Design a protein around this ligand. Sequence first.
Ligand SMILES: OC[C@H]1O[C@@H](O[C@H]2[C@H](O)[C@@H](O)[C@H](O[C@H]3[C@H](O)[C@@H](O)[C@H](O)O[C@@H]3CO)O[C@@H]2CO)[C@H](O)[C@@H](O)[C@@H]1O
Ligand SMILES: OC[C@H]1O[C@@H](O[C@H]2[C@H](O)[C@@H](O)[C@H](O[C@H]3[C@H](O)[C@@H](O)[C@H](O)O[C@@H]3CO)O[C@@H]2CO)[C@H](O)[C@@H](O)[C@@H]1O
Length: 430
Amino acid sequence: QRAGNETPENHPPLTWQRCTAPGNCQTVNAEVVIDANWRWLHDDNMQNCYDGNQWTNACSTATDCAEKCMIEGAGDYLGTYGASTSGDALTLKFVTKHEYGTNVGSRFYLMNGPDKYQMFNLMGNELAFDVDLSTVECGINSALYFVAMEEDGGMASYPSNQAGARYGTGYCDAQCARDLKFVGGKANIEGWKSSTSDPNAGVGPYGSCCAEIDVWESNAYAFAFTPHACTTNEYHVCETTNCGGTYSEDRFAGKCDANGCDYNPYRMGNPDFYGKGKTLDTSRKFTVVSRFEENKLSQYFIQDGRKIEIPPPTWEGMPNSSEITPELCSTMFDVFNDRNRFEEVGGFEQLNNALRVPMVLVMSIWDDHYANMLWLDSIYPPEKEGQPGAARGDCPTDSGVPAEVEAQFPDAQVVWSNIRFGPIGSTYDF
Ligand SMILES: OC[C@H]1O[C@@H](O[C@H]2[C@H](O)[C@@H](O)[C@H](O[C@H]3[C@H](O)[C@@H](O)[C@H](O)O[C@@H]3CO)O[C@@H]2CO)[C@H](O)[C@@H](O)[C@@H]1O
Ligand SMILES: OC[C@H]1O[C@@H](O[C@H]2[C@H](O)[C@@H](O)[C@H](O[C@H]3[C@H](O)[C@@H](O)[C@H](O)O[C@@H]3CO)O[C@@H]2CO)[C@H](O)[C@@H](O)[C@@H]1O
């Protein structure tokens, strides 16, 4: 899909820092871009190629939708989407009201120049960030993660898209982004079915698949550290039958891990470790440094200067430790009562061969129509409960309801900042 010129594209700048050794790094004058699903699509004589949850008569097929339509700069990222950067801090607003619309959650990808998002060599180094989710309530996911999208935006891989990373095209994770309106520069209009609760969404035929490492899926009641690996980690397209994820009737259908191997302290048997008032106090802002080693992913916090280690798990027959190692991913499933995709798609070796694939840093805040963040902040699937693995937070299973938590605390915000990247133990000294 080409680009439309009714709106110029202006990426807020977001400073991060490249480290070499402790108490010494190097800043990074970066910028930021919003995922391409939030912009406007039209044709030459102006009018939507996609209005609301449905496509338009203007469009007819995967191909002629890319040679006919185009995407647009985001207008003012602040007033239209709650987007707002301040030096090193990227604020993101959950519920934003404007003249004639209503943006709901968004996605942002660290850049390198207005043409390229910034690629990331994880395996052997670590990533850290300050985060203030203190008003991110039950049902919202204020997210920070890596998903191997392409460098330029997939523009050379699929030149039907001449917008490229320039306009947030190209998003892919490990659930096959079936919701995107374009994947591999083709429009997902053919057979596009509209959402049943999301007035802005729909699920497409093609999804955008690749690997995903979920350093931080959360809000102030619980967090989760979840990598996910694929039979091919790199960007890649699934086709209807060969699509799994939330968006296809067969979750584990395709080449990827949609569940991956999480570590949620609460889920692992420690209730009182993370929240408002807990050891890790989420009422206040903190530091989450996280590491990448073959067969090991470590993640520690810094609150009020102090190092805070996450508690090892509790239940019998689980590893002694908190680290995401293949002993975990193995054992996790001998008692957590869940389908082991992890071993299916390659086990922790395949993830390590995923830890070496070029990645890009997404920061985000969203609510989830298919499960109301049930899987993150409480007991899910809320079909019995009282088993190992179901309780995953301190939220009642009433919450997360899209419309509802959109009305209860619509000032909710995540605040992303003070990013640090480099070899293991460079970003801090704990
Ligand atoms: O001008 C076009 C409209 O874009 C709106 O953005 C919505 C997008 O249409 C939609 O693709 C995006 O989908 C999100 C979804 O909100 C979220 O629940 C899910 O977790 O991720 C999806 C990824 O596609 O929703 C946004 C939210 O609005 C603008 O907000 C709107 O002003 C504008 O009319
Ligand atoms: O943040 C990026 C992506 O998040 C995805 O959320 C998935 C989580 O990564 C995963 O931990 C969770 O696993 C659930 C599984 O859905 C469910 O079948 C089972 O009962 O509980 C598992 C954990 O115990 O899956 C969610 C999706 O439901 C988004 O799916 C993805 O679109 C987004 O980019």
